[PDB]
Every structure is written in C-alpha cells, then in structure tokens.
Design a protein around this motif. Structure first.
Motif, PDB file in Angstrom:
ATOM      1  N   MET A 123       0.821  -1.201   0.000  1.00  0.00           N
ATOM      2  CA  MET A 123       0.000   0.000   0.000  1.00  0.00           C
ATOM      3  C   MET A 123       0.859   1.256   0.000  1.00  0.00           C
ATOM      4  SD  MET A 123      -3.107   0.861   2.626  1.00  0.00           S
ATOM      5  CE  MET A 123      -2.051   1.120   4.039  1.00  0.00           C
ATOM      6  N   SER A 124       2.010   1.213   0.679  1.00  0.00           N
ATOM      7  CA  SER A 124       2.938   2.341   0.700  1.00  0.00           C
ATOM      8  C   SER A 124       3.504   2.618  -0.683  1.00  0.00           C
ATOM      9  CB  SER A 124       4.076   2.047   1.671  1.00  0.00           C
ATOM     10  OG  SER A 124       3.572   1.773   2.961  1.00  0.00           O
ATOM     11  N   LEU A 125       3.982   1.564  -1.350  1.00  0.00           N
ATOM     12  CA  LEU A 125       4.573   1.698  -2.676  1.00  0.00           C
ATOM     13  C   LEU A 125       3.544   2.161  -3.697  1.00  0.00           C
ATOM     14  CD1 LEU A 125       7.138   1.252  -4.299  1.00  0.00           C
ATOM     15  CD2 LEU A 125       6.321  -1.046  -4.811  1.00  0.00           C
ATOM     16  N   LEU A 126       2.380   1.511  -3.713  1.00  0.00           N
ATOM     17  CA  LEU A 126       1.380   1.837  -4.717  1.00  0.00           C
ATOM     18  C   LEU A 126       0.745   3.196  -4.475  1.00  0.00           C
ATOM     19  CD1 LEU A 126      -0.306  -1.605  -5.188  1.00  0.00           C
ATOM     20  CD2 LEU A 126       1.136  -0.389  -6.784  1.00  0.00           C
ATOM     21  N   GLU A 127       0.592   3.623  -3.222  1.00  0.00           N
ATOM     22  CA  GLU A 127       0.073   4.964  -3.027  1.00  0.00           C
ATOM     23  C   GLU A 127       1.140   6.029  -3.175  1.00  0.00           C
ATOM     24  OE1 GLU A 127      -2.979   6.167  -2.821  1.00  0.00           O
ATOM     25  OE2 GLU A 127      -3.784   4.155  -3.146  1.00  0.00           O
ATOM     26  N   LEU A 128       2.422   5.661  -3.173  1.00  0.00           N
ATOM     27  CA  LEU A 128       3.407   6.578  -3.728  1.00  0.00           C
ATOM     28  C   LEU A 128       3.188   6.749  -5.220  1.00  0.00           C
ATOM     29  CD1 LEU A 128       5.697   8.453  -3.278  1.00  0.00           C
ATOM     30  CD2 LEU A 128       7.176   6.695  -4.277  1.00  0.00           C
ATOM     31  N   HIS A 129       3.272   5.653  -5.967  1.00  0.00           N
ATOM     32  CA  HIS A 129       3.353   5.789  -7.413  1.00  0.00           C
ATOM     33  C   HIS A 129       2.001   5.959  -8.084  1.00  0.00           C
ATOM     34  CE1 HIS A 129       7.654   5.036  -7.452  1.00  0.00           C
ATOM     35  NE2 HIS A 129       7.420   4.150  -6.502  1.00  0.00           N
ATOM     36  N   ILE A 130       0.915   5.509  -7.464  1.00  0.00           N
ATOM     37  CA  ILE A 130      -0.420   5.733  -8.014  1.00  0.00           C
ATOM     38  C   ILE A 130      -1.267   6.367  -6.918  1.00  0.00           C
ATOM     39  CG2 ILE A 130      -2.371   4.742  -9.226  1.00  0.00           C
ATOM     40  CD1 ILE A 130      -0.551   2.264  -9.657  1.00  0.00           C
ATOM     41  N   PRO A 131      -1.410   7.686  -6.890  1.00  0.00           N
ATOM     42  CA  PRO A 131      -2.141   8.321  -5.791  1.00  0.00           C
ATOM     43  C   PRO A 131      -3.645   8.143  -5.928  1.00  0.00           C
ATOM     44  CG  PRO A 131      -1.424   9.968  -7.343  1.00  0.00           C
ATOM     45  CD  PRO A 131      -0.822   8.675  -7.808  1.00  0.00           C
ATOM     46  N   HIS A 132      -4.302   7.982  -4.781  1.00  0.00           N
ATOM     47  CA  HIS A 132      -5.753   7.930  -4.720  1.00  0.00           C
ATOM     48  C   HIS A 132      -6.237   8.829  -3.602  1.00  0.00           C
ATOM     49  CE1 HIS A 132      -5.060   4.106  -6.913  1.00  0.00           C
ATOM     50  NE2 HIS A 132      -6.148   4.496  -7.551  1.00  0.00           N
ATOM     51  N   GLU A 133      -7.496   9.249  -3.724  1.00  0.00           N
ATOM     52  CA  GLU A 133      -8.048  10.276  -2.847  1.00  0.00           C
ATOM     53  C   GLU A 133      -8.222   9.757  -1.427  1.00  0.00           C
ATOM     54  OE1 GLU A 133     -11.605  11.358  -4.897  1.00  0.00           O
ATOM     55  OE2 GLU A 133     -10.539  12.393  -6.511  1.00  0.00           O
ATOM     56  N   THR A 134      -9.070   8.756  -1.250  1.00  0.00           N
ATOM     57  CA  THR A 134      -9.304   8.158   0.052  1.00  0.00           C
ATOM     58  C   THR A 134      -8.772   6.733   0.039  1.00  0.00           C
ATOM     59  OG1 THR A 134     -11.282   9.524   0.295  1.00  0.00           O
ATOM     60  CG2 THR A 134     -11.022   7.714   1.812  1.00  0.00           C
ATOM     61  N   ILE A 135      -8.054   6.366   1.096  1.00  0.00           N
ATOM     62  CA  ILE A 135      -7.403   5.069   1.208  1.00  0.00           C
ATOM     63  C   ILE A 135      -8.128   4.268   2.276  1.00  0.00           C
ATOM     64  CG2 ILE A 135      -5.259   3.877   1.689  1.00  0.00           C
ATOM     65  CD1 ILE A 135      -3.847   6.473   0.844  1.00  0.00           C
TER      66      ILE A 135
ATOM     67  N   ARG B 260       3.572  10.573   5.692  1.00  0.00           N
ATOM     68  CA  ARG B 260       4.165  11.795   6.211  1.00  0.00           C
ATOM     69  C   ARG B 260       3.676  13.012   5.446  1.00  0.00           C
ATOM     70  NH1 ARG B 260      10.343   9.703   7.309  1.00  0.00           N
ATOM     71  NH2 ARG B 260       9.800   8.264   9.015  1.00  0.00           N
ATOM     72  N   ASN B 261       3.345  12.849   4.166  1.00  0.00           N
ATOM     73  CA  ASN B 261       2.642  13.910   3.459  1.00  0.00           C
ATOM     74  C   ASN B 261       1.203  14.049   3.934  1.00  0.00           C
ATOM     75  OD1 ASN B 261       4.745  14.831   1.729  1.00  0.00           O
ATOM     76  ND2 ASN B 261       4.434  13.044   0.414  1.00  0.00           N
ATOM     77  N   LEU B 262       0.626  12.989   4.504  1.00  0.00           N
ATOM     78  CA  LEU B 262      -0.706  13.085   5.095  1.00  0.00           C
ATOM     79  C   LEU B 262      -0.694  13.873   6.397  1.00  0.00           C
ATOM     80  CD1 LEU B 262      -2.178   9.508   4.558  1.00  0.00           C
ATOM     81  CD2 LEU B 262      -2.923  11.643   3.538  1.00  0.00           C
ATOM     82  N   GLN B 263       0.222  13.539   7.311  1.00  0.00           N
ATOM     83  CA  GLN B 263       0.267  14.246   8.589  1.00  0.00           C
ATOM     84  C   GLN B 263       0.727  15.687   8.420  1.00  0.00           C
ATOM     85  OE1 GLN B 263       2.557  12.000  11.424  1.00  0.00           O
ATOM     86  NE2 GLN B 263       0.804  10.759  12.069  1.00  0.00           N
ATOM     87  N   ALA B 264       1.629  15.940   7.478  1.00  0.00           N
ATOM     88  CA  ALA B 264       2.015  17.311   7.179  1.00  0.00           C
ATOM     89  C   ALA B 264       1.064  17.991   6.207  1.00  0.00           C
ATOM     90  CB  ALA B 264       3.438  17.355   6.620  1.00  0.00           C
TER      91      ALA B 264
ATOM     92  N   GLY C 267      -1.663  16.531  -7.007  1.00  0.00           N
ATOM     93  CA  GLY C 267      -2.071  17.844  -6.550  1.00  0.00           C
ATOM     94  C   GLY C 267      -3.314  17.899  -5.694  1.00  0.00           C
ATOM     95  N   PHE C 268      -3.453  16.986  -4.736  1.00  0.00           N
ATOM     96  CA  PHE C 268      -4.559  17.055  -3.792  1.00  0.00           C
ATOM     97  C   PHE C 268      -4.155  16.393  -2.485  1.00  0.00           C
ATOM     98  CE2 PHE C 268      -5.783  12.643  -4.380  1.00  0.00           C
ATOM     99  CZ  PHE C 268      -5.463  12.379  -5.696  1.00  0.00           C
ATOM    100  N   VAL C 269      -4.878  16.751  -1.431  1.00  0.00           N
ATOM    101  CA  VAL C 269      -4.648  16.196  -0.103  1.00  0.00           C
ATOM    102  C   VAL C 269      -5.416  14.887   0.015  1.00  0.00           C
ATOM    103  CG1 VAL C 269      -4.923  16.569   2.357  1.00  0.00           C
ATOM    104  CG2 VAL C 269      -4.257  18.454   0.877  1.00  0.00           C
ATOM    105  N   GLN C 270      -4.701  13.805   0.319  1.00  0.00           N
ATOM    106  CA  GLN C 270      -5.321  12.496   0.447  1.00  0.00           C
ATOM    107  C   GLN C 270      -5.925  12.319   1.842  1.00  0.00           C
ATOM    108  OE1 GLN C 270      -2.535   9.442  -0.442  1.00  0.00           O
ATOM    109  NE2 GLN C 270      -2.383   9.927  -2.621  1.00  0.00           N
ATOM    110  N   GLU C 271      -6.466  11.129   2.094  1.00  0.00           N
ATOM    111  CA  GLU C 271      -7.112  10.835   3.362  1.00  0.00           C
ATOM    112  C   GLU C 271      -6.936   9.359   3.673  1.00  0.00           C
ATOM    113  OE1 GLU C 271     -11.249  11.738   3.419  1.00  0.00           O
ATOM    114  OE2 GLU C 271     -11.469  11.418   5.584  1.00  0.00           O
TER     115      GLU C 271
END
Lengths: 130, 284
Positions: free
Chosen positions: A72-84, A115-119, A126-130
């Motif tokens: 999940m860490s690797l794939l949400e680095l390289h393929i971003p999604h809005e809500t996880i 860490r991009n989520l907590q910060a 270009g969007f804030v994930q969750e």
C-alpha cells in the motif's frame, strides 16, 4: 534487477471467452534487505510494469489484508488515490497492557505518503489524500 | 472466494483494477476465482517475478472490471460460478494453462540459475538490485542491532578483539551459572556476527561465503568466527588467559560453550543483513 527480467517476470494474459471445459531456499533472502517489518513487496514491484494499474487514478483504493502496508505504501506513492481504505486480520486480544489501538501497519507509518498526510502536503496529482 | 467476489463487485467501479495474490498449487481456489471474476471482468492477467518463487508458482492475478448489472445479476453470476465449480468445470482454457505452466517452469529454472550462481556472480547480482530507487519510498535497510551501537576490515578486527577481551574478562570476574555464562557468550557470539556483517564489504568475499555457510548451517561456533590462536595473537593479555583458564578451557568456551542455535526468521534476518552488506549499506 535480474529477478524481475523476462525469464522470471512474465505478463501472461488470460483467455477470456473460453468455453466451460472439465478438467526452503534461504539464499533468495539475500535480496530482501530493505524493510525491517515486512519483506514482501518486491512482488508488488512487478505490478508497476502493468500500465493498466497505473492508469487507474482519480478514485478510491481498497486494500485488503495487508498487515504491514508496504504494498500500500509503494502503490500509493506511485499511483495516488483520494481516500485510502485499509483492512487487516486483527483480533482485539493483541493489545499490550493498558493500551487501546487498532490495526496500524508499521512500515506504512514510515511511508512518505503518510508523512505527506500528517504534514498535509498535496500529492503528486495535486490534492490532499485521506 | 464468494466474499472476495461480493466485495469486488460492490466496491470497484467500471474500468477498475482488482489485484489478488494467489498460489497455483491450490488449483481449486484458482479456478474458483476465475469462475467468479471472469464473467464480471473484461481482462485477465497473471504476473510473477522471481521473488515469489518457492516451488509452488505464486502469482498475482489482475482483473479489470467492466459493467455489472444489479443484485439479480450479482446473485446470478455468483450462483452460476458456484454451479460451475460444483460440476468440475471452469472458464480457464487449455492452451492458456499450458503456456502458464511453461512460464512457471521457465521461472523456476531461471531462479535456480540465479541462486546457484558463483559467489562473484552473486556479488554482481546483489550490487545490481532494484532496492535503491523504487523500494526506498521510506524503506529502510535491514540493519542489525549493533549497527545502532557503533559510532564509526582491520579496525573492525581490532574492535572484535577488544570485544572478546571484555567478554572473557567478564567470564573471569564471574568466578573471581553455567547456562548464564552460555547466555553471555551466545550474546557475545551474536554481536561478533553483527559486527562481522558490518565488516562485510563488497570486496572481501571469502568472509561472505563463510558467514553464509554459518547461517545456512543452523548453528554458529566462535571457532569459526575467529580461530583460538589467531585471536590470541590479536589479543592483549593472552598469558593471563592461559594462566587463569588455559587453551583447554577456552577451547571449550569458544565452540561448545556458545553454540548458538537460530530460528528460521533469525537466519532470514542475517541473510538480509549479508545481502545489505554486499550492497554497500554498512561501510558508506
């Protein structure tokens, strides 16, 4: 790199409309030297070779039975999604004395996405994930 | 498989990706997932790099979801696929599964070719791993516990000499209990191992092969990590050790006084440590 080349890593596409027929190696742990909690997302690095997985952005992302979230860490680095969304076999007996916290994937807490989520840094699309 | 099918059919939008890890020796569950997703999905994939190779053909299966009608359609697809798995049948093809078996046999042969390579070729393969760029999205190298107990080849051997001097002086100040001394010497053995794999650079490969053989053997003796007389040449006060305890008693203390059995996962951890040692993750 040779473990993910052509005579090991294949892309076998399946037959779609076929009719209804009726019919201990400790050496390979030399390669698994990154990741202190899990070591099982080199298998998921092969999934980035598929273009159709990387052509699946702008949506939700269900994750089932990770336990360490490194895939999940690797794939949400390289393929971003809005809500996880995140699932794990987790009995509630596993807690320490006088503590209360549910399923926490260890390496996903150390991930750059989290860490991009907590910060509250926006992602690479270009969007804030969750 | 019914639960996975219902979750995927309710949760995934059209054109979405469904990735499922699976074995292949469990053929029944494989044909059953084929039955449950193949009328639902428009695409199929099987993919597996070298890391999944155990001897049982583990692989990912990636479906791409097309359209799904409604709860009547969901119940009909699930019931029809349960009917088909009841009647010893599946939607999988013959030429497809034979090409699948050919790819798995080719993968097993190539994995056996990679793993059984020479040790300089093992060094060439370990230095060219993809762990550098892709996996370091926060991924840390698997460092042993004495790697966090250091501040800074031959100076590593000096450190090992000072360490074994301190531990044998602890053994002397013990009696000036038996399993407890064995515990202290096993911990000494474990830390000598960790400092040794700290010392394993990409140049000295004889120590690499010897430590790999010690891990694969199951136990570790201190006679193999450093010889008796070689250490006493590299010691500080060997005459005091020969006067108090002697070569008989210290020879008992090296091998059989600290015969460190490992588990499976401890052997896994140290093989990961040796791999990071070859990759250049401890000498900078």
């Amino acid at each position: 790199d040779q473990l993910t080349m052509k005579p090991a890593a294949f892309l076998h596409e399946l037959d779609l409309s076929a009719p209804a027929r009726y019919d201990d190696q400790l050496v390979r742990y030399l390669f698994r030297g990154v990741g202190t909690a899990s070591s099982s997302w080199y298998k998921a690095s092969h999934l980035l070779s598929v273009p159709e997985i990387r052509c699946a952005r702008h949506g939700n992302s269900l994750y089932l039975a990770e336990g360490s979230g490194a895939i999940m860490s690797l794939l949400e680095l390289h393929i971003p999604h809005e809500t996880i969304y995140y699932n794990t076999l987790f009995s509630n007996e596993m807690n320490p004395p006088q503590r209360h916290f549910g399923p926490t994937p260890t390496q996903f807490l150390n991930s750059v996405v989290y860490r991009n989520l907590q910060a509250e840094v926006p992602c690479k699309d270009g969007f804030v994930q969750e | 498989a019914t639960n996975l099918s219902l979750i995927a059919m309710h949760s995934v939008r059209e054109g979405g990706v469904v990735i499922v890890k699976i074995l292949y020796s469990m053929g029944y569950y494989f044909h059953l997932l084929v039955n449950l997703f193949t009328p639902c999905s428009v695409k199929g994939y099987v993919l597996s790099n070298g890391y999944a190779c155990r001897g049982d053909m583990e692989c990912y299966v990636v479906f791409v979801m097309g359209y799904l009608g409604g709860p009547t359609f969901v119940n009909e697809v699930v019931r029809m696929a349960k009917t088909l798995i009841q009647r010893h049948g599946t939607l999988l093809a013959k030429s497809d599964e034979t090409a699948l078996m050919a790819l798995f046999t080719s993968q097993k042969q190539r994995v056996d070719n990679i793993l059984s390579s020479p040790l300089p070729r093992l060094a060439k393969l370990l230095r060219r791993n993809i762990d550098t760029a892709l996996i370091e999205a926060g991924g840390q190298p698997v460092r042993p516990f004495c790697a966090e107990s250091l501040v800074n080849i031959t100076q590593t051997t000096q450190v090992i000499a000072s360490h074994i001097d301190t531990v044998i002086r602890s053994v002397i100040y013990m009696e000036a209990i038996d399993g407890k001394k064995r515990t202290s010497l096993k911990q000494c053995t474990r830390q000598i191992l960790e400092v040794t794999i700290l010392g394993l650079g990409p140049e000295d490969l004889n120590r690499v092969g010897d430590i790999i053989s010690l891990i694969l053997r199951g136990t570790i003796s201190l006679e193999d990590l450093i010889p008796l007389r070689t250490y006493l040449k590299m010691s500080t006060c060997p005459k005091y050790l020969k006067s108090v305890l002697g070569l008989t008693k210290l020879r008992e203390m090296f091998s059989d006084g600290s015969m460190l059995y490992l588990t499976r996962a401890q052997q896994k951890f140290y093989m990961k440590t040796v791999g990071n040692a070859v990759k250049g993750y401890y000498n900078s």
